[PDB]
Each structure stands twice: as C-alpha cells, then as structure tokens.
C-alpha cells in the first residue's frame, strides 16, 4: 500500500487551502482517511477522520467549523479543505490509511494510522 499527496503551497492569512490525497493497493471503501498535522518543531496533532464509505466525518475540536473533508471513491482520493488560514497553521499535513475507526460503522477499532503518505507543507 502507498499514499501520495499534493505539493507544497504558500498562503496568506484569510486564505483557504485544498489539500489532496490519493491512494492505492487496498480496498478504498474499507478504510478511512485520517489527517494529522505537524507544525515545524512540534509533535503530531489529529485534525479529523472521514469515512470513504458513507461520509461520516469526525473533527478535532480545534478544527470544527474550519475544516471540510470529502472523499471520491471513483478516483480513490480524499480531500481536506482548511479555511480561514492563519500563520499559526504552518504545518506538514499528512494523509494516512485508517484502521482506528470503522469505515462502515463508525466504531473504535484496534489499530491506528497504518499507512502514511509523504505529507505536504502548507505555509
């Protein structure tokens, strides 16, 4: 299994960024997509989780109302749009294959963020 993402971008405060992710080597609708950000010099922060099967989406309180997630099973992709950007948002945004929450039922699973992509830096 492999995950790939978009290149780096630079945005001014008040701007929005559409962060894309593509993946292959597994049944897309069986695993969710998790997004984790890492600001320079910082650790990992969870942003959200989206079901590739039914659109069920969970968000970190920090990004509720700021981030919109969506998936498209016909292209094997997922997207994360972060609106109303601040300089405080500088980070590498990582896309990972998820077995932490069920894609079909939304319940917690024994597993984690099992396959991570390269990540993309947004200034």
């Amino acid at each position: 299994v492999q995950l790939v993402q978009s290149g780096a971008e630079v945005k001014k405060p008040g701007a929005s960024v559409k962060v894309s992710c593509k993946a292959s080597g597994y049944p897309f609708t069986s695993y969710g997509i998790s997004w984790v950000r890492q600001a320079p010099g910082q650790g990992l922060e969870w942003m959200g989780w989206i079901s590739t099967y039914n659109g069920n989406t969970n968000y970190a309180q920090k990004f509720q109302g700021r981030v919109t997630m969506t998936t498209d099973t016909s292209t094997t992709t997922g997207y994360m749009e972060l609106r109303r950007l601040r300089s405080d948002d500088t980070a590498v945004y990582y896309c990972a294959r998820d077995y932490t929450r069920g894609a079909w039922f939304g319940e917690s699973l024994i597993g984690g963020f099992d396959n991570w992509g390269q990540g993309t830096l947004v200034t």
């Binding site: 609708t29 077995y99 069920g102 894609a103 319940e107 597993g111």
Partner: peptide, 25 residues
C-alpha cells in the same frame, strides 16, 4: 459490487457488548 464487507470492524472492535445486551451489525 466493489465494496468489501466490514468483518474487520466486528472482530477487531475496541469494545464488545454484554451478553444480556448483545450487538447486531
């Protein structure tokens, strides 16, 4: 059909129900 059945979500679940109040997926 291209979607696969969520058996993993049944067997690899974090929590299981009590026998008096069993879950049905």
């Amino acid at each position: 059909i291209t979607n696969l059945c969520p058996f993993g979500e049944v067997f690899n679940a974090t929590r299981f129900a009590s026998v008096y109040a069993w879950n049905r997926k």
